[PDB]
């Protein structure tokens, strides 16, 4: 009932900021570029330094013309609207945003530990305590997002950054949707798609709890529960609802996963009468202090190597391309609300 009051306050704050988003809170020549941290079909993310303060940030730069070309207008505007409106310990903070003739810019706190993905593939797999530490943060994050009627829809280790204290930061919301009932879009990453998405059903927030099962499985095993050479063959396995577990999985872990990786929506944990508490109260989470996780007081099992501010060792190396700003304004009408 402290959770009830907390979430109602959180929803009132979200909705005020959703209805009146912030705009145009810095400009490009306030920053020096340091390094490209990631590329993509219509954008890049760069490590930048704010000239006045010397603070480092991650700057996402989206080429408006490419956004239009790849049909990503709504997704791009939606991500920025979400980021400036949410507030939760495991969601990245949007510090500034602005646009010019060519690009949209979102400036976020720099998360120096990189994607969980790299750490998982390097180490092979996480122990169950290590996996549980990360899983608890996702459970709280989905409890928050779902209470705002936001379905996340692209959970995966790639989308989970690790901060300097070893805790998770979610940065991408390009597929999230505010949807109190059902929605229908085929979207996500093949390994993480819930069966009802593959089967072209109307679906709801229960897809996020299925994806948590896939994440917990892949963290604890080192590989996801359903894989194949091609996505079409991944989908056949997913909808079969046949899963095999490594022999080192505990009984508690297998029981939780049978209940998350549940094809039948009337039986999937997270979607039942008791909602999220079926997950929080499950034996695999018995040792979890949910409040201490929220308060970031639990000692993290893994701390990324960080040699100071602006260390980029946990990201891959990319070819540095120019940041061109056209003499002509591109796509002004499409992006007015950014």
């Amino acid at each position: 009932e402290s959770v009830k009051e907390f979430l109602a306050k959180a929803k009132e704050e979200f909705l005020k900021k959703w209805e009146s988003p912030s705009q145009n809170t810095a400009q490009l020549d306030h920053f020096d570029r340091i390094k490209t941290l990631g590329t993509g079909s219509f954008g890049r993310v760069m490590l930048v330094k704010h000239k006045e303060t010397g603070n480092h940030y991650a700057m996402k730069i989206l080429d408006k013309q490419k956004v239009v070309k790849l049909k990503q207008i709504e997704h791009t505007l939606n991500e920025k609207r979400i980021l400036q409106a949410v507030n939760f310990p495991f969601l990245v903070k949007l510090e500034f945003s602005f646009k010019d003739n060519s690009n949209l810019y979102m400036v976020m706190e720099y998360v120096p530990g990189g994607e969980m993905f790299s750490h998982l593939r390097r180490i092979g797999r996480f122990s169950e305590p290590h996996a549980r530490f990360y899983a608890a943060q996702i459970v709280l994050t989905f409890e928050y997002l779902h209470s705002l009627d936001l379905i996340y829809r692209d959970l995966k280790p790639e989308n989970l950054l690790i901060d300097q204290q070893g805790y998770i930061q979610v940065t991408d919301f390009g597929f999230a949707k505010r949807v109190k009932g059902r929605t229908w879009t085929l979207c996500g990453t093949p390994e993480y798609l819930a069966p009802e998405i593959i089967l072209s059903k109307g679906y709801n927030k229960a897809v996020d709890w299925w994806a948590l099962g896939v994440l917990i499985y892949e963290m604890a095993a080192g590989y996801p529960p359903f894989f194949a050479d091609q996505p079409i063959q991944i989908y056949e396995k997913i909808v079969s609802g046949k899963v095999r577990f490594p022999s080192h999985f505990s009984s508690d872990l297998k029981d939780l996963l049978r209940n998350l990786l549940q094809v039948d929506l009337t039986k999937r944990f997270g979607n039942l009468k008791n909602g999220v508490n079926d997950i929080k109260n499950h034996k695999w989470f018995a040792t979890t202090d949910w409040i201490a996780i929220y308060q970031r007081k639990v000692e993290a099992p893994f701390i990324p190597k960080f040699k100071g501010p602006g260390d980029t060792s946990n990201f891959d190396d990319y070819e540095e391309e120019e940041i061109r700003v056209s003499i002509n304004e591109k796509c002004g009408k499409e992006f007015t609300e950014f």
């Binding site: 790639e158 085929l186 990453t189 093949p190 080192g222 894989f227 194949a228």
Partner: peptide
């Protein structure tokens, strides 16, 4: 092994959304 099958899948690297 299951691990060997995962390597042979060719989907061990970063995965894009559909």
């Amino acid at each position: 092994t299951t691990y060997a099958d995962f390597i042979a899948s060719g989907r061990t690297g970063k995965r894009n959304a559909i």
